[PDB]
Amino acid sequence: GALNNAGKGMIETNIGNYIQQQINLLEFIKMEMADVAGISKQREG
Amino acid sequence: TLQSSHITEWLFTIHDDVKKRALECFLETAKVALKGRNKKFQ
Incomplete structure (x- = not known):
């Protein structure tokens, strides 16, 4: 019953946290x- | 704002020396067009 269900998987890398x-x-x-x-x-302004 | 105008003031110190030496050089250019029978300079 995984062939009718279980959502759709994401190929997601968490590089947005690595960029931060x-x-x-x-x-x-x-x-x-x-x-x-x-x-x-404050010295530069 | 007075110390943010200092980061750009290096560019204005050298620019006002070009405006000094181009107006000196234009002044010796005007000095030699006098002896060229130009009736503007009267």
């Missing part, structure tokens, strides 16, 4: 680089 992992890391280093030069976001 790098973007949260790119924001962290650009903040960390801003601190070591002493040039904050």
